[PDB]
Amino acid sequence: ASKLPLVTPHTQCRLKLLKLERIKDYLLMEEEFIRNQEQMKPLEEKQEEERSKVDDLRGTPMSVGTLEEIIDDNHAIVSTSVGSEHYVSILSFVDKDLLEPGCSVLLNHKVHAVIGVLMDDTDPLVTVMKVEKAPQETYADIGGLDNQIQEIKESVELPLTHPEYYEEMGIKPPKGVILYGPPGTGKTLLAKAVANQTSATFLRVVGSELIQKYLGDGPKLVRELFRVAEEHAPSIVFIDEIDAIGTKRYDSNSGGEREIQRTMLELLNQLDGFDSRGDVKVIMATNRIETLDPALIRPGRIDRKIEFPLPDEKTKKRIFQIHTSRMTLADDVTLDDLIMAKDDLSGADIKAICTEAGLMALRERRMKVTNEDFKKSKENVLYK
């Protein structure tokens, strides 16, 4: 039960013999120590006697109150659910430690004295923003990039899995990572691969839903966001499409662009607060890297800037090989004709043509996908 942290001898050596046999000595002494209590203590039982005595102190109508201050000599001002508030005292089975301003407590029904504290069932927004399971397959699903993969493992994964290199180097990891390029080139996809890979708690928020309809609710949402991200452990915060805070204007926003601006001010703090930040990693992505404020883009707030180019054809054929792997491909087709059909197709375009061609197969109930499926498929996808 969290008895001792020194576990380092690791082998059949004798620090373990003397030390594990030392707590073993004090557990023979502990067992025969407590053995005299059940041997020669018939006065009270104390396993439930004094427990039932506490349960006879506290009444059955256990009211739930709220903390707003603390005075140390076991009395404080607590608020009832009505709003009228008291100056009750605090019991001695209330282990004054989980008492913060705003905490849910248990009061008496009669004199409303502080009986116990209450575990919080938590805000649903944490479960809203928390990614639970692994999204999809690994980095082998990606293909073609092979350089920025080393960059992202370099900035995120290798600091996590090997915290030896940076200490023999005498260095800290690079802080901020941003992603940019043309749309549909794998920016979200690589983040799915990282969410597959890591063991840190992973958070994802769309940049569009940063904006609000009430005044200051944006920056309050940012503050409680980084509260949530900090209060866990070594985590990863992902933000997609942060240009959308600057591009579009919506009529739900009661403030103008001079509320969006203040939201960017509070975020601009929360990347680079004077406070000790902690073990929080930030991964950002957009396709309009030129629109936003470069004060958010400076090194110190974002260190590594990673461009995603359009696929060259050699890489394209690899992507065809990926998205046509487990499908019953008829031999009629030639992928090299399908490569140069569009000069600047994205990685999403290939998967769109493959899936839509499979839909053309399931129109005719067949099992293999033929050439004219691709011939009308590129007409369906590309041209409209």
């Binding site: 008895k3 001792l4 020194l6 380092t8 001898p9 690791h10 082998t11 059949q12 050596c13 004798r14 620090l15 013999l17 003397l18 030390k19 046999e21 030392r22 707590i23 000595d25 004090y26 557990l27 023979l28 002494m29 502990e30 025969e32 120590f33 407590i34 005299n36 209590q37 041997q39 020669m40 203590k41 104390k46 140390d72 000599d73 001695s92 200490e167």
Partner: protein
């Protein structure tokens, strides 16, 4: 299921061993050549430790086991070659041919004959050959033979050499961490007669390796912290010749054979003092070894370096005696006046600030016993050369007011002002000595015995405290004149002034408050010989303690100096010498557990602890032996303090659990002392658990037990953020916890931790876990606080200056001849290396690096850089010579 096809090994080893009784008689070639093909194929096809699924080793013995039992025993004409082909094949799978009762019958194949040169088919293979089989030999077979049949037949004589070539086979194959399996052979082989195997592998260990001396060496001290009595007796004297015969590290001798000093042989460490005085190299390691012999773990040595070559290295002994003691002065003279420490810090009484405004008004606490603690505004903060010129007026104007033991207290504070001094400490006493007062003169001359602590020069062999002693017809002109002499000469083994203090015991004077601390003076001097001391104690114990039924003045004081007269050995002879000495009524048999367990300061012999907790556990005790069970609980406070850390969390998971919460008297009255006898280390697992039962007062009991654990709770040194927990307890201590008996005690508690800033390493664990006597000087106060009647009159002789073996704080020290280098240090957490891959990662707290004399802390291990290599002693010892060397381009 892919069976058949390649099944040659379940067919031809199924047929030819089956036709081997049909091919032994009347077929002379098929008996032996198929046995040769049964030996090289089972040999070569099982040498590899990657295919542990051999094709015969789990296959042939469905028929080959009964064929073996009808092959080796049922043949009866076993000749000279067919034993080397038979018992080399039938001996390899036999720990897995048989089931778990193989252990009595490893010999029905092997003892017929050990075939030849058994390692020839055990060269490449690590432990699947027979090393597991030889572990099965030494586990059960050598235990049953060598229980009372050590000097024996083939089961010992060849087994020495089999257990020699297998033991060198551990240091033959790889130099892996299977090397450390060899003490698991050398220990489990002949557990009590460990000498005969350590002779068999000590010279093989001499020819083994020099790089394999460091982890084998810490392997042997890695048992030799503590053990069973005979294992600690034999393995520690076998521990010594490894840095002398094989290795030449040769500088960690005295601090690691202080272990091997007391229980083994008192002349063994004297012969190792001779081994110190043989290796006469030059001056660095020779200096550093004999540095620790004065004021780091022992004394009684300053008559042994007067040989015929007194120039500088045999003239080292005076430098050991007082010049590096003057370097311990030079700590606060040069290297603590620069950092923070002013002439009068004074600001902790200033830190008692805002009780005038914490909810109401103030100027209400006007108790006269508050000035007993306001004397420690002068007393506690003036350690480490905080000398005062007309800033002792809080003891001067209280010195002439009332409180006669306070006239003892303010004059007694001057010794705590001038500590580790010889230069002017006798002169700072005389400016307040002359007052014609039996209190002022005995407190101040009692502080004369405090100033010279660790000097043992001409200060008072018979000079000052003999003149203080010879006045006596009355109070302190009798008492305080022996305690400063036992305190000052507590590190000495001089017999003459011990015999000057022998008629103090043999006086049979009615001054019982003097004759009680007479044992607390003479017990502090010697721990070995002079049974006439124990005779003089027990004769007054019979002449005074037998014809009475009174309080703990006898019990807390008279046998405690006998525990200090017989401290520190596991031999269990002294328990016969003293437990059969006061065979008596049980209130005089209070001393049954004194000398029995005071000899057991650090070990593990838990069979002592079952006779420490099963005789008198509680028994509901209707006011009969609660004090004897509080002393039976008092002797639970050793066995724990230096046996290498690992014990604190379960000590608090014992005594924080079932006496203090679910006991009657032993817990609620007494059982908190363990947390001020084991520790002053500091961890939240009990520092945040004792004010859980202490912040509540529980006034039903004799409430100065819980308030007795208030200041004691605050006993913990290495000052911390505990000003919240103690300042809230004294702020509620303003109204509650009434000031008529504890106004000395609350500010005693507040001033105890951070009286100064430094000087707190008093916790009996030096280097790694060496003793350094944190028991003869720390003991009589924790023994002294059991009942009461000593917070006001009698125990004020003890509550001031009880523990005074304060062997400083720090280890950041250069000690070059010029004193020009600073350091190259890097303080961290306690060590993490026992073995890992290669360069054993030492510890994990890389983020800090200093170069100066700065603070120590307990769980710290300090290394460096710059290619300095620390070539002096390397382990620990806080006075590395720190020379440098540059064969590293």
């Amino acid at each position: 299921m892919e069976e058949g096809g390649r099944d040659k090994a379940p067919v031809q080893p199924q047929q030819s061993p089956a036709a081997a009784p049909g091919g032994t008689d009347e077929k002379p070639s098929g008996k032996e050549r198929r046995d040769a093909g049964d030996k090289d194929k089972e040999q070569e096809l099982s040498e590899e430790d990657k295919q542990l699924q051999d094709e015969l080793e789990m296959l042939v013995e469905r028929l080959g086991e009964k064929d073996t039992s009808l092959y080796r025993p049922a043949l009866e004409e076993l000749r000279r070659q067919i034993r080397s082909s038979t018992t080399s094949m039938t001996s390899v799978p036999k720990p897995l041919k048989f089931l778990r009762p193989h252990y009595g019958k490893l010999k029905e194949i092997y003892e017929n004959m050990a075939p030849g040169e058994n390692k020839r088919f055990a060269a490449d293979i690590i432990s699947v050959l027979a090393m597991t089989m030889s572990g099965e030999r030494e586990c059960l077979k050598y235990r049953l033979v060598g229980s009372q049949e050590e000097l024996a037949s083939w089961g010992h004589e060849y087994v020495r050499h089999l257990a020699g070539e297998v033991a060198k086979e551990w240091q033959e194959l790889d130099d892996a961490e299977k090397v450390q399996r060899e003490p698991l052979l050398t220990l489990v082989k002949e557990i009590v007669p460990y000498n005969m195997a350590h002779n068999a592998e000590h010279e093989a260990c001499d020819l083994l390796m020099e790089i394999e001396q460091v982890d084998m060496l810490e392997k042997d001290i890695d048992e030799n912290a503590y053990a069973k009595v005979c294992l600690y007796l034999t393995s520690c004297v076998n521990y010594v010749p490894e840095p002398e015969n094989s290795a030449l590290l040769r500088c960690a001798l005295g601090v690691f054979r202080k272990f091997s000093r007391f229980p083994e042989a008192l002349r063994l460490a004297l012969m190792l003092n001779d081994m110190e005085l043989v290796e006469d190299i030059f001056t660095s390691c020779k200096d550093v070894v004999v540095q620790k012999q004065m004021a780091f773990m022992l004394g009684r040595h300053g008559v042994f370096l007067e040989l015929s070559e007194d120039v500088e290295e045999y003239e080292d002994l005076t430098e050991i005696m007082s010049n590096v003691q003057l370097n311990s002065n030079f700590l606060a003279l040069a290297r603590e006046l620069d950092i923070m420490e002013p002439k009068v810090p004074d600001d902790i009484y200033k830190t008692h600030l805002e009780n005038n405004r914490f909810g109401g008004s103030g100027s209400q606490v006007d108790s006269a016993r508050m000035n007993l603690a306001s004397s420690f505004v002068n007393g506690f903060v003036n350690a480490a050369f905080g000398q005062d010129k007309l800033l002792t007026d809080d003891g001067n104007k209280w010195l002439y007011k009332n409180k006669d033991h306070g006239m003892l207290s303010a004059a007694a504070s001057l010794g705590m002002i001038l500590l580790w001094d010889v230069d002017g400490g006798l002169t700072q006493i005389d400016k307040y000595l002359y007052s014609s007062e039996d209190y002022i003169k005995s407190g101040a001359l009692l502080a004369c015995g405090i100033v010279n602590s660790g000097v043992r020069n001409e200060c008072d062999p018979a000079l000052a405290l003999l003149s203080d002693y010879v006045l006596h017809n009355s109070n302190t002109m009798r008492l305080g004149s022996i305690f400063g002499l036992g305190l000052a000469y507590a590190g000495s083994n001089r017999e003459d002034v011990l015999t000057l203090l022998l008629p103090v015991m043999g006086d049979s004077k009615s001054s019982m408050e003097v004759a009680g601390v007479t044992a607390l003076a003479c017990g502090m001097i010697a721990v070995g010989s002079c049974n006439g001391d124990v005779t003089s104690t027990i004769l007054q114990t019979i002449m005074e303690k037998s014809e009475t039924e009174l309080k703990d003045t006898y019990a807390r004081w008279l046998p405690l100096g006998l525990g200090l007269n017989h401290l520190g050995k596991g031999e269990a002879i002294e328990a016969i010498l003293a437990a059969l000495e006061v065979v008596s009524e049980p209130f005089r048999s209070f001393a049954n557990t004194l000398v029995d367990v005071c000899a057991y300061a650090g070990s593990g012999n838990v069979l002592k602890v079952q006779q420490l907790l099963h005789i008198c556990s509680e028994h509901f005790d209707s006011k009969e032996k609660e004090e004897d069970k509080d002393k039976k609980e008092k002797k639970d406070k050793d066995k724990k303090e230096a046996p290498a850390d690992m014990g604190a969390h379960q000590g608090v998971a014992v005594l924080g659990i079932a006496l203090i919460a679910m006991g009657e008297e032993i817990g609620a009255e007494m059982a908190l002392r363990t947390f001020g006898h084991l520790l002053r280390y500091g961890e939240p697992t009990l520092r945040r658990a004792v004010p859980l039962a202490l912040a509540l007062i529980s006034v039903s009991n004799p409430r100065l037990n819980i308030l007795d654990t208030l200041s004691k709770f605050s006993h913990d040194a290495d000052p911390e953020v505990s000003y919240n927990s103690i300042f809230a307890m004294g702020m509620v201590g303003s109204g509650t916890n009434n000031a008529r008996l504890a106004a000395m005690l609350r500010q005693l508690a507040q001033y105890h931790a951070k009286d100064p800033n430094n000087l707190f390493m008093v916790r009996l664990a030096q280097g790694l876990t060496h003793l350094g006597k944190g028991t003869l000087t720390l003991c009589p106060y924790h023994s002294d606080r059991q009942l009461m009647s000593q917070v006001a009159v009698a125990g004020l002789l003890t509550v001031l200056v009880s523990f005074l073996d304060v062997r400083n704080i720090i280890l950041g020290k250069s000690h070059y001849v010029l004193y020009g280098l600073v350091a190259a240090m890097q303080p961290r957490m306690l060590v993490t290396f026992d073995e890992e891959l290669r360069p054993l990662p030492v510890s994990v707290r890389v983020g800090q690096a200093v170069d100066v004399v700065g603070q120590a802390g307990k769980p710290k291990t300090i290394t460096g850089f710059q290619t300095h290599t620390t070539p002096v002693l390397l382990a620990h010892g806080e006075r590395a010579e720190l020379a440098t060397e540059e064969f590293l381009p």
